[PDB]
Amino acid sequence: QESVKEFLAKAKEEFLKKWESPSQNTAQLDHFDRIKTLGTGSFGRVMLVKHKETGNHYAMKILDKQKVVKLKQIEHTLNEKRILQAVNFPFLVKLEFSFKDNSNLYMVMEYVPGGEMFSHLRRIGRFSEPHARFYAAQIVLTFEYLHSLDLIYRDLKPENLLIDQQGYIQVTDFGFAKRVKGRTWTLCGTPEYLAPEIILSKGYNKAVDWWALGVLIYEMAAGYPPFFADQPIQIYEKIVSGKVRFPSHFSSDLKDLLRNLLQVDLTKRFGNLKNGVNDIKNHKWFATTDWIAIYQRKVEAPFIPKFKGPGDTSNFDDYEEEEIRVSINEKCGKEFTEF
Numbered sequence: 001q002e003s004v005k006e007f008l009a010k011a012k013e014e015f016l017k018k019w020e021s022p023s024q025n026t027a028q029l030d031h032f033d034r035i036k037t038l039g040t041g042s043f044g045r046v047m048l049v050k051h052k053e054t055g056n057h058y059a060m061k062i063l064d065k066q067k068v069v070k071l072k073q074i075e076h077t078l079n080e081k082r083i084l085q086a087v088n089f090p091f092l093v094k095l096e097f098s099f100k101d102n103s104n105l106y107m108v109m110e111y112v113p114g115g116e117m118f119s120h121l122r123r124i125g126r127f128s129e130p131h132a133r134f135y136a137a138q139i140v141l142t143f144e145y146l147h148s149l150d151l152i153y154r155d156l157k158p159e160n161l162l163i164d165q166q167g168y169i170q171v172t173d174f175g176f177a178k179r180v181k182g183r184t185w186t187l188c189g190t191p192e193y194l195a196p197e198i199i200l201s202k203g204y205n206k207a208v209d210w211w212a213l214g215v216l217i218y219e220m221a222a223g224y225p226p227f228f229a230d231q232p233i234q235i236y237e238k239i240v241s242g243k244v245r246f247p248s249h250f251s252s253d254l255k256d257l258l259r260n261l262l263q264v265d266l267t268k269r270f271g272n273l274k275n276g277v278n279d280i281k282n283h284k285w286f287a288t289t290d291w292i293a294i295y296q297r298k299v300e301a302p303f304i305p306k307f308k309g310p311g312d313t314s315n316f317d318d319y320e321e322e323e324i325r326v327s328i329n330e331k332c333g334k335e336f337t338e339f
């Protein structure tokens with residue numbers, strides 16, 4: 001494990017150098033052509049763009065500054081960009097450029113054309129245990145990396161996991177990620193994936209990412225999440241009870257892993273014990289996993305998405321196409337000085 005200790009020590013050195021001196025203002029809007037909207041939200045959207053001089057394709061996340069302020073997301077938005085420009089790991093989407101103008105904030109990422117894990121899971125129904133285990137091992141390594149840097153991710157769900165041209169995962173959307181030594185308190189995340197200590201308004205820590213990994217593995221292997229209900233208040237009641245029913249087709253090793261990740265007592269939850277991530281890596285359900293081979297991307301993927309080239313949008317869906325307007329006057333300049 002010395003080689004793992006020294007890898008993580010080097011990873012932290014390189015993150016901290018970029019964290020302390022973040023890059024800013026590395027492109028501008030009229031360097032790109034707009035192609036298609038890939039997703040939309042409360043204060044921002046993600047567009048496929050093409051760089052006019054190089055011809056490269058990118059995914060550009062665009063946030064309306066005035067709406068960020070109104071939804072009280074200033075701190076979270078600054079978190080997202082400062083973390084994304086500082087990290088480097090095989091299963092994290094790469095931030096290529098960032099900039100701002102009178103109206104908007106922009107984060108320009110590599111474009112991953114295979115689509116969201118959500119689409120593929122819902123089309124096929126459920127993943128076999130080896131298929132789920134291939135994806136789960138990538139998230140285990142990514143959380144080991146993020147947590148060693150004192151980062152909590154806080155938005156694990158199938159919609160945020162993109163599948164690349166080799167069938168591996170690229171994690172996207174750091175809107176709720178935060179550097180945290182100790183506890184933190186914000187209510188955020190999707191209802192089906194929230195740990196009990198978030199719902200109960202406690203000070204919580206990185207163990208909430210390991211709870212969310214339990215939810216994700218269950219959903220990949222069953223086809224639906226463990227605390228499913230029609231409205232959030234009913235979901236929250238099932239989460240805090242912790243009663244979980246497992247389908248009969250689950251293996252005994254899978255049920256045992258999930259009982260330890262979906263542990264309502266955070267001081268007993270796998271990932272948060274004295275042996276840290278190794279209680280997960282050494283569990284019987286991962287016995288066939290070569291952790292080094294996954295990191296080096298040398299395992300053949302269970303599934304390669306169908307797409308025609310780096311500009312193909314066929315694995316994403318259709319949204320109304322709205323203008324990208326930039327006001328003649330600067331909005332919210334002070335609030336976003338550091339961006």
Ligand SMILES: c1cc(-c2nnc([C@H]3CCNC3)o2)ccn1
Nearest residue numbers: 071072073074075076185186187
């Ligand atoms: C303190 C507060 C926050 C924060 N961010 N959004 C919120 C929500 C409260 C109102 N709706 C959004 O609170 C972050 C860090 N410290």
Ligand SMILES: c1cc(-c2nnc([C@H]3CCNC3)o2)ccn1
Nearest residue numbers: 039059110111112159160172173
């Ligand atoms: C393609 C897409 C993206 C991307 N970034 N954030 C998102 C969110 C949009 C909806 N759920 C995820 O998608 C990055 C690279 N290629």
